[PDB]
Ligand binder design. Structure first.
Ligand SMILES: *[C@@H]1O[C@H](CO)[C@@H](O[C@@H]2O[C@H](CO)[C@@H](O)[C@H](O)[C@H]2NC(C)=O)[C@H](O)[C@H]1NC(C)=O
Ligand SMILES: *[C@@H]1O[C@H](CO)[C@@H](O[C@@H]2O[C@H](CO)[C@@H](O)[C@H](O)[C@H]2NC(C)=O)[C@H](O)[C@H]1NC(C)=O
Ligand SMILES: *[C@@H]1O[C@H](CO)[C@@H](O[C@@H]2O[C@H](CO)[C@@H](O)[C@H](O)[C@H]2NC(C)=O)[C@H](O)[C@H]1NC(C)=O
Ligand SMILES: *[C@@H]1O[C@H](CO)[C@@H](O[C@@H]2O[C@H](CO)[C@@H](O)[C@H](O)[C@H]2NC(C)=O)[C@H](O)[C@H]1NC(C)=O
Ligand SMILES: *[C@@H]1O[C@H](CO)[C@@H](O)[C@H](O)[C@H]1NC(C)=O
Ligand SMILES: *[C@@H]1O[C@H](CO)[C@@H](O)[C@H](O)[C@H]1NC(C)=O
Ligand SMILES: *[C@@H]1O[C@H](CO)[C@@H](O)[C@H](O)[C@H]1NC(C)=O
Lengths: 216, 226, 75, 49
């Protein structure tokens, strides 16, 4: 989970349904509600900060070269798909489908629309496939994806010649492994439990808030 | 050169801090919320809370206790409720700081006390070393980092055939300036001639893809010949 | 001089096609700013300069120089 | 959430942007590379190990 629904509830409209008599009594309690309104603002602006920190970690928007010649690896699943209206990759949409008033309760919009977020994850993903870790350090440096993986092996202590000798076998093991990810997400919704749990708690929180209105 | 780049780099930090306070926003923010919270606390004292007067003594005066008790009781519930909110805000806000302090401890233990290979944990870019500086109710780090600046395009190859045996670089990668093949270290252009010392042989040419023909100079043989 | 957004009704700010770095956040992807003769402009956010990488299967970029940059982190 | 957000923030920087030698910080097994994918009010990582 990264962010939650940015909600703001008005002081008076909830407490007093537009009664001046009820309003005047509320002024006796002083500055209670204005800190409530202010506290909920503090949460709200914070969430737009969360999504900044998770995603806005790349200073430029890289895009992959047109031709997907990656030494045998197959990122067609995770890379953006132009045909779909929102510039989203195939695996992203399996996520957006799996995951699913008027008393002063307003739901503020997030600052980063789901389109723009998809550009960062396209940028970060495009960066990883052509420049490895370099774009994090500084200017992104092109490097053939065969070698970058050979670097990565050399990171975990397996010498390089293991990869170049077994490039073909690794590619299929990587391509097939992506394949199983789709099916696990496409068929089983238990995976997305955590995000679904965030949404349910908030919607359940508001409903309890509204239900409290109609009690003596 | 590096000394000059380091000395000037410290110099700019003064100027950015000297003129603009936008950097110090985060510490100043903590002061405001706490200071602002107290203003709300004392402000609630003047509020009536649905009693005849907000001043407690004026209730002690202006009427005898048996009735005045009812007015005071209304005052207490209002005031007591104000603390419940104010304290509960602090605990939650105090938890935020304590989470930030633990991050500072980890950042201090892992950035200044030693080099950290965690990417972007100690400053943008490759990390060298860190300096702590105390600040009001906070800590300020100067992360000294290494950032690779100027790059060139070179044609590269995964491996080199010499006599039908594939050669892989012990460290660094093979780069060609267009006519000659070199092995250079990963993060700096320091081209140097291919030798059996730079390269460890493995397997056979055919399996590797993209391997390129070239020659691998051997230090020993000229020594033997001479 | 009214402009309609998903955030709400925005009055007194002039829409522009050009995108810039987010300056004052309105939400749903629009940020407002003071710019040139100066006035208030509301624009779609710019997520950063577009930069495709000259990738290929046999081309590598090696840095030939470095800059020691010192940054500030405040907690 | 903020604690979860930073954990993603750290995991984004130290796992996507670079290979990380921390064990099980990036999925079981020796870590090679990770991919980010957006999701409703969250982020989903693929950890290639
Ligand atoms: C990467 O994998 C995808 C499959 O996920 C390939 O796309 C398929 O290509 C075949 C032709 O070989 C078509 O018959 C399928 O309909 C395609 N599937 C989809 C979902 O479009 C793609 O060709 C692979 N890329 C490479 C370079 O091999
Ligand atoms: C690539 O680098 C090699 C090595 O420096 C260059 O070969 C040398 O070129 C100089 C002339 O600039 C000659 O004086 C040397 O005798 C050459 N060395 C050898 C071993 O032949 C080469 O010119 C460079 N080419 C390019 C295109 O950069
Ligand atoms: C590298 O050089 C070798 C020779 O040492 C080349 O091998 C030749 O390949 C052709 C094409 O199959 C054959 O007709 C020859 O008989 C091979 N030579 C020998 C001695 O067997 C190889 O093609 C070269 N590769 C590159 C990429 O230049
Ligand atoms: C590496 O980059 C540094 C960046 O400063 C270069 O140093 C500068 O060189 C110029 C020469 O034209 C001097 O006028 C500057 O004073 C130098 N800067 C500093 C901070 O001293 C250096 O020349 C570059 N090295 C190479 C080989 O290109
Ligand atoms: C490398 O080649 C590409 C070719 O498109 C070019 O755009 C790029 O500027 C070159 N690198 C440098 C440092 O000039
Ligand atoms: C690299 O790509 C080119 C196409 O631009 C192709 O002709 C060549 O065979 C490829 N080489 C390798 C080693 O993949
Ligand atoms: C944006 O550009 C279009 C044509 O490209 C133009 O018709 C429109 O008026 C422009 N928007 C503004 C606010 O000027």
């Amino acid at each position: 989970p990264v962010s939650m629904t940015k909600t703001s509830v008005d002081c008076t409209m909830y407490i007093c349904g537009d009664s001046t008599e009820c309003s005047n009594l509320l002024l006796q309690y002083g500055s209670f509600c204005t800190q409530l309104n202010r506290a909920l603002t503090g949460i709200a602006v914070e969430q737009d900060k969360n999504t900044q920190e998770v995603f806005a970690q790349v200073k430029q928007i890289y895009k992959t070269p047109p031709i997907k010649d990656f030494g045998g690896f197959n990122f067609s699943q995770i890379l953006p798909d132009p045909s779909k209206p929102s510039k989203r990759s195939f695996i992203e949409d399996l996520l957006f489908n799996k995951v699913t008033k008027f008393n002063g309760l307003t739901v503020l919009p997030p600052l980063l629309t789901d389109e723009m977020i998809a550009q960062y994850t396209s940028a970060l993903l495009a960066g990883t496939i052509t420049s490895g870790w370099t774009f994090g350090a500084g200017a992104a440096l092109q490097i053939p994806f065969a070698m970058q993986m050979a670097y990565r092996f050399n990171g975990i202590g397996v010498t390089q010649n293991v990869l170049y000798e077994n490039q073909k076998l690794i590619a299929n093991q990587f391509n097939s492994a992506i394949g199983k990810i789709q099916d696990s997400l496409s068929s089983t919704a238990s995976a997305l439990g955590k995000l679904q749990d965030v949404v349910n708690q908030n919607a359940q929180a508001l409903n309890t808030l509204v239900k409290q209105l109609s009690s003596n | 050169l590096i000394a000059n780049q380091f000395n000037s780099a410290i110099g700019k930090i003064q100027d950015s801090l000297s003129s603009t306070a936008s950097a110090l926003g985060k510490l100043q923010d903590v002061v405001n919320q706490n200071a602002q919270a107290l203003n709300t606390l004392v402000k609630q004292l003047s509020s009536n809370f649905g009693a005849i007067s907000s001043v407690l003594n004026d209730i002690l005066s202006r009427l005898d206790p048996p009735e005045a008790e009812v007015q005071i009781d209304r005052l207490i519930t209002g005031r007591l409720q104000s603390l419940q909110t104010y304290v509960t805000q602090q605990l939650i806000r105090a938890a935020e700081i304590r989470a930030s302090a633990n991050l500072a401890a980890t950042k201090m233990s892992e950035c200044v006390l030693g080099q950290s290979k965690r990417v972007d944990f100690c400053g943008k870019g490759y990390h060298l070393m860190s300096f702590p500086q105390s600040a009001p109710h906070g800590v300020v780090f100067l992360h000294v980092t290494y950032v690779p600046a100027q790059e060139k395009n070179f044609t590269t190859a995964p491996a080199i055939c010499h006599d039908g045996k594939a050669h892989f670089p012990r460290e660094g990668v093979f780069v060609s300036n267009g006519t000659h093949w070199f092995v250079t270290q990963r993060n700096f252009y320091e081209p140097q001639i291919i030798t059996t010392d730079n390269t460890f042989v493995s397997g056979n040419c055919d399996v590797v893809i993209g391997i390129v023909n070239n020659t691998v100079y051997d230090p020993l043989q000229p020594e033997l010949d001479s | 001089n009214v402009f309609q957004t998903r955030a709400g009704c925005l009055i007194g700010a002039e829409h522009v096609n050009n995108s810039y770095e987010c300056d004052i956040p309105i939400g749903a992807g629009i940020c407002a700013s003071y710019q040139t003769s100066q006035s208030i402009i509301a624009y779609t956010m710019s997520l950063g300069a577009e930069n495709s990488v000259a990738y290929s299967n046999n081309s590598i970029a090696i840095p030939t120089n470095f800059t020691i940059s010192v940054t500030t982190e405040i907690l």
